[PDB]
Structures are given as C-alpha cells and as structure tokens.
Amino acid sequence: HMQKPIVRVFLPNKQRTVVPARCGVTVRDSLKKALMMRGLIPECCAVYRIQKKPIGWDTDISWLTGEELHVEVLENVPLT
Amino acid sequence: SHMQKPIVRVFLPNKQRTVVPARCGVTVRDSLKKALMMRGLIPECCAVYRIQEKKPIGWDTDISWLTGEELHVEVLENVPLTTH
Numbered sequence: 443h444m445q446k447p448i449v450r451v452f453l454p455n456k457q458r459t460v461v462p463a464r465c466g467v468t469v470r471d472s473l474k475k476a477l478m479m480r481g482l483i484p485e486c487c488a489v490y491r492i493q494k495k496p497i498g499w500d501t502d503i504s505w506l507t508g509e510e511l512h513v514e515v516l517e518n519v520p521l522t
Numbered sequence: 523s524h525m526q527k528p529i530v531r532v533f534l535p536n537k538q539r540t541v542v543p544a545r546c547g548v549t550v551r552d553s554l555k556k557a558l559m560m561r562g563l564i565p566e567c568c569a570v571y572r573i574q575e576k577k578p579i580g581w582d583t584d585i586s587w588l589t590g591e592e593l594h595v596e597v598l599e600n601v602p603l604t605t606h
Contacts, residue, residue: 466604488578490567493597496569496578502604517572517579519587522549 447507453480454515455485463507470499473513482515489513528589534561535568544589551581554595569596574576 447463453471470484477483478489488494490512497511527584538561542553549559551565558565565581572579573592 470563488582491599494576496596497599497601498567498603499602500575500603500605501599502606505601514578517574517583518585519572519579521580521582522547522584 449503450510451504452510452512463504465504467503468499468505469501472503487513489516525588530585530588531592533592533594543585544586546586548585550583550585553585567598569598
C-alpha cells in the first residue's frame with residue numbers, strides 16, 4: 443500500500459512471512475531473519491517471483507513491492 | 523553409454539543446448555562458463571535447475587553428481603540490484 447509497501451513471501455513447508463519493501467535493502471537481507479528462524483540460509487535456497495521466475499538474492503526488494511516471492515531450498519547435491 | 527563418457531545435457535536460453543563432461547571435481551559454474559559466454563551470459567545473471575519438475579541447484583555443485591541428468595539454465599529476472 444501507499445503507506446506501508448510490503449512483499450509477501452512464501453517459505454518452505456507451507457510457511458510465510460511479510461517483509462517491508464525498503465529502498466536499498468537486498469532480498470537476502472530482507473529475508474535473513476525469517477530464514478534463520480527456520481534454520482535456512484539464503485545461500486542454500488533460491489528465491490522466485492510470480493509473473494516461476496528466478497530472482498537474484500542481491501535484488502533491491504523495493505522494486506518488488508506488492509509482489510509475492512517464493513523461497514525454495516536448493517537441491518541437496520554436494521559442492522566441489 | 524555414460525560408463526566411458528559421463529555427460530550432462532544442458533538446456534540454455536532461447537531454445538539452445540549443450541553437452542558438458544561430468545568430471546569429478548568440476549562445478550556446474552565452471553562446466554558451463556564457456557557455453558554461457560558464447561551467448562553473452564554469465565552464471566551470476568542466471569539460475570540453474572535439474573529436472574526431477576524444475577528444482578534449483580547451486581552453481582557450485584559438483585557436476586559429477588549429475589551425470590545422466592538434464593539441467594536447464596534461465597536468465598534471472600531483470601530487477602535492479604541495491605548497488606544500481
């Protein structure tokens with residue numbers, strides 16, 4: 443809304459959160475706490491918008507005000 | 523087939539494709555670096571998925587775990603970074 447710009451975020455395991463769509467704040471930093479609370483970290487997850495479209499973790503979240511993001515855990519395959 | 527020559531099939535943006543060697547110890551990023559560059563892409567501007575149906579994998583994944591699989595590379599949504 444005009445007063446309170448937010449982004450709705452759907453999380454693993456049927457969970458969800460709302461974060462403020464603050465200018466200059468990455469998606470990564472916007473969601474760090476919500477992820478931590480659930481034992482997740484951005485580096486082990488992918489984020490996407492709707493309208494199944496992947497977005498970078500370093501995106502400025504204010505560009506996505508009004509949108510829904512989805513966070514999925516990355517496939518469990520060993521790193522090099 | 524793969525016994526002698528383990529490979530991963532990779533689908534790329536704009537209906538393109540490539541095959542890469544699935545060699546132990548090599549990242550997805552590095553396996554695909556050259557194919558992406560030929561198309562003016564960079565892994566950091568893209569996402570990669572395995573077919574299982576599209577499940578996101580990390581760029582630093584060891585590609586040898588994916589022998590026989592099909593990967594898909596998509597360009598990230600065009601949304602400014604905070605540094606822009």
